[PDB]
Amino acid sequence: ENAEWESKPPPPGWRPKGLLVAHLHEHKSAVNRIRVSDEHSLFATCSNDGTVKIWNSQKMEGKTTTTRSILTYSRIGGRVKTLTFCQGSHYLAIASDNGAVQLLGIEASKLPKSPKIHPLQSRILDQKEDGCVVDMHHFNSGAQSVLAYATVNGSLVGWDLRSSSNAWTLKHDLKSGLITSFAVDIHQCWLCIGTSSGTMACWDMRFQLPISSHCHPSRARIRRLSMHPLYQSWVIAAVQGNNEVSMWDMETGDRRFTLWASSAPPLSELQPSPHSVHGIYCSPADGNPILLTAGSDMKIRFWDLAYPERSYVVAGSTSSPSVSYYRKIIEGTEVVQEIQNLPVGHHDIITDVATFQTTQGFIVTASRDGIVKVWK
Amino acid sequence: FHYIYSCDLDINVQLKIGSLEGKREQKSYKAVLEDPMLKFSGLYQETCSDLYVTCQVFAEGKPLALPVRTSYKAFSTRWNWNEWLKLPVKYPDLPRNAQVALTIWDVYGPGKAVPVGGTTVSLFGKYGMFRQGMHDLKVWPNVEADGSEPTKTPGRTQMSRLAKLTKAHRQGHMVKVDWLDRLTFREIEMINESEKRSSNFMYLMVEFRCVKCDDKEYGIVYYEKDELVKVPDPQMSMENLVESKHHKLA
Amino acid sequence: LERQKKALGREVALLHKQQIALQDKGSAFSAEHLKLQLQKESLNELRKEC
Amino acid sequence: RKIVAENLEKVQAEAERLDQEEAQYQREYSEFKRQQLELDDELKSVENQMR
Numbered sequence A: 001e002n003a004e005w006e007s008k009p010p011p012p013g014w015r016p017k018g019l020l021v022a023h024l025h026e027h028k029s030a031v032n033r034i035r036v037s038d039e040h041s042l043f044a045t046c047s048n049d050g051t052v053k054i055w056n057s058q059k060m061e062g063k064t065t066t067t068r069s070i071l072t073y074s075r076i077g078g079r080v081k082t083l084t085f086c087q088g089s090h091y092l093a094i095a096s097d098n099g100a101v102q103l104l105g106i107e108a109s110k111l112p113k114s115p116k117i118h119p120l121q122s123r124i125l126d127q128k129e130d131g132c133v134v135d136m137h138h139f140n141s142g143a144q145s146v147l148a149y150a151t152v153n154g155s156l157v158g159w160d161l162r163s164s165s166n167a168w169t170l171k172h173d174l175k176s177g178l179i180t181s182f183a184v185d186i187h188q189c190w191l192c193i194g195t196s197s198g199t200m201a202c203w204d205m206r207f208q209l210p211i212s213s214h215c216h217p218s219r220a221r222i223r224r225l226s227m228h229p230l231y232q233s234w235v236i237a238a239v240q241g242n243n244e245v246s247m248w249d250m251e252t253g254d255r256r257f258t259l260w261a262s263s264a265p266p267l268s269e270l271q272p273s274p275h276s277v278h279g280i281y282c283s284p285a286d287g288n289p290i291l292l293t294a295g296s297d298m299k300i301r302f303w304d305l306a307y308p309e310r311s312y313v314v315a316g317s318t319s320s321p322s323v324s325y326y327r328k329i330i331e332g333t334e335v336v337q338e339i340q341n342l343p344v345g346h347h348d349i350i351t352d353v354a355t356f357q358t359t360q361g362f363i364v365t366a367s368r369d370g371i372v373k374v375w376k
Numbered sequence B: 001f002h003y004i005y006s007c008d009l010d011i012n013v014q015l016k017i018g019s020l021e022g023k024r025e026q027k028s029y030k031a032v033l034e035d036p037m038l039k040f041s042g043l044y045q046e047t048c049s050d051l052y053v054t055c056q057v058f059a060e061g062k063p064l065a066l067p068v069r070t071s072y073k074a075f076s077t078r079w080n081w082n083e084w085l086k087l088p089v090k091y092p093d094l095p096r097n098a099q100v101a102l103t104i105w106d107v108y109g110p111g112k113a114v115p116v117g118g119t120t121v122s123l124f125g126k127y128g129m130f131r132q133g134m135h136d137l138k139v140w141p142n143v144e145a146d147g148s149e150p151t152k153t154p155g156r157t158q159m160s161r162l163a164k165l166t167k168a169h170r171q172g173h174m175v176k177v178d179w180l181d182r183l184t185f186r187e188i189e190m191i192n193e194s195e196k197r198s199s200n201f202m203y204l205m206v207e208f209r210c211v212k213c214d215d216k217e218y219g220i221v222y223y224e225k226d227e228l229v230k231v232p233d234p235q236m237s238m239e240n241l242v243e244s245k246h247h248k249l250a
Numbered sequence C: 001l002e003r004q005k006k007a008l009g010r011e012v013a014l015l016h017k018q019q020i021a022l023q024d025k026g027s028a029f030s031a032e033h034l035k036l037q038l039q040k041e042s043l044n045e046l047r048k049e050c
Numbered sequence D: 001r002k003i004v005a006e007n008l009e010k011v012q013a014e015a016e017r018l019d020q021e022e023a024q025y026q027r028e029y030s031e032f033k034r035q036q037l038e039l040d041d042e043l044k045s046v047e048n049q050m051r
Helices: B029-034 B159-170 B179-198 B241-248 C002-049 D002-050
Strands: A031-037 A042-047 A052-056 A083-085 A091-095 A100-106 A117-119 A136-139 A146-149 A157-160 A165-169 A179-184 A191-195 A200-204 A209-214 A234-236 A247-249 A255-258 A277-283 A290-295 A300-304 A323-325 A338-340 A350-354 A363-367 A372-375 B003-005 B012-021 B052-059 B080-090 B099-109 B112-115 B119-122 B134-139 B202-207 B219-221
Touching: A031 A083, A031 A350, A031 A363, A042 A083, A052 A091, A083 A136, A091 A136, A136 A179, A200 B179, A209 B179, A277 A350, A290 A350, B012 B052, B012 B099, B012 B134, B052 B080, B099 B202, B119 B134, B159 B179, C002 D002
Parallel strands: B003 B219
Antiparallel strands: A031 A042, A042 A052, A083 A091, A091 A100, A100 A117, A136 A146, A146 A157, A157 A165, A179 A191, A191 A200, A200 A209, A234 A247, A247 A255, A277 A290, A290 A300, A323 A338, A350 A363, A363 A372, B012 B080, B012 B202, B052 B099, B099 B112, B099 B119, B134 B202
């Protein structure tokens, strides 16, 4: 009951104007994840060039000094494809494409002229028994620092980081399809696993038993799941196609809100659009949830779920005409369609949107060419 | 946590015989060929037989009272006794390791009975508490329910994991959620059904007096009410019983 | 004899059903493996193009 | 009856073989699909950069 959905940085970026404060460009191939840990005032980004660069949350302003990474680490190898700051602990975790998972103690407790990084643990997985890692989520349940990670072969595991032993090991059926994302309840009572064929399984972490939740009508590829801060049994899925970010309940298993933003007829399935969405940040805030989705069109949208017609965009090109966000029921679902009447925006597919705050909330992004931009 | 001691609770222990759920194995043709009596046996009849389940309380390998039969009840498609047997023994007279044998019987011929199973479930389980609820005992085949201690026909041995967790749920020890457990409970029901189906042995269901004249919330717990001088003497001042015996006699 | 014959008939029917099911499953497996082979070839081609 | 039972047992053995083969094939398909999706994403990105 005591735990809260609110993440490290509460929402003070109530309304991003689209202003930019930094253009950190150090990565080389493709950034594919961003984390923020305000307990230490830091945030991190990985990529396919085999590096995991740590920045500083107070040096991003770049008002006086230049903006550059505080640390680096490129000894894991492969293609670092996920990471998670460990809550209540001063270390980070990363998972390479070699099939290796390792901790990396961050020397934030000491603040000398030489920031330090030091490996602590390590755990290597086979290439025919478990496979590489596709996701990672950390929660400090009870007195065990659980680090749950998924695998290609479909066996979600929990690697306790205090006694260094398995806490639980759920198994997933690969007759459905590969795993692509999953989210864990805010109080560790159930989890949702999305696949690459539309299936959205569910599990009961108290009994480790399986509960089904739903499928997808177009059998498309799911790209990102999340837990709604208000509905206890809600998961915000972002299916590929038609720039869609729908919301599915589990006790009943049916759609209840579609963030339609494409030219196809609402809830259409005649393969009409190639665009998709991957990257989300939902925040209940003051009872009026705000939802930012950055997708493959190089745009950063701001949906005001309280009033769908007051939403706007905060990045793009100078030739984009103004648009209008509707609100129309369609067979028992609010479908908020979107219809249209030196550019600082990203020039390639955006792969994440975080939001760290020190005094005034900033927004962080990263495209598939390594760029990073800390809006205001 | 409220409870009443076994010593104070002075009533007759009651047991419900539920339904014998399972599949019954038959012999080959040569068996009936050599012994024609098997044709008229109960098991060789097309419809379910009119079995009756005896019950006797044991302790330390010693029978504690006479067995109790089940009143005659006809059967058409299933074994559903649903009868509330009354046992001769009472709560304050049950030792710690008391165990209830339950034997099934069937006709074999004029004036003969043949056991079709046997199960033995302890009454006072772990932590010294009287087993309650609806327990499904195992059924050892073609062996009379053995009462020796340790028993050679025990009743109850991921199904085990869910058995413990379900208990902790209804004793208050679990996270609280409505829909999730509403679906998970049906999941456990299906899992238990599958596990029972796979098992080759039979399984006799049984229930204890979870609901009685007193509030159901109470539970039963085993209980009973029992340097001048250096060299011990444990009978220093008592009656000389041998003296009394001699005085009374002549 | 009659009871044994009834049991035999039931067993024969069940075996026939199972055999047909096995044949269908094998055919499906072969088709799926062939599809996987072709898919991997196409993936290699796409890698060259990229 | 004995012959029929033995045939059923052999059929069950072959079913187990088929199930194991299915599991291996599904693992292979998972790996392939992972690579395919990653390649499509990179292809689209490179095309956009070229334009």
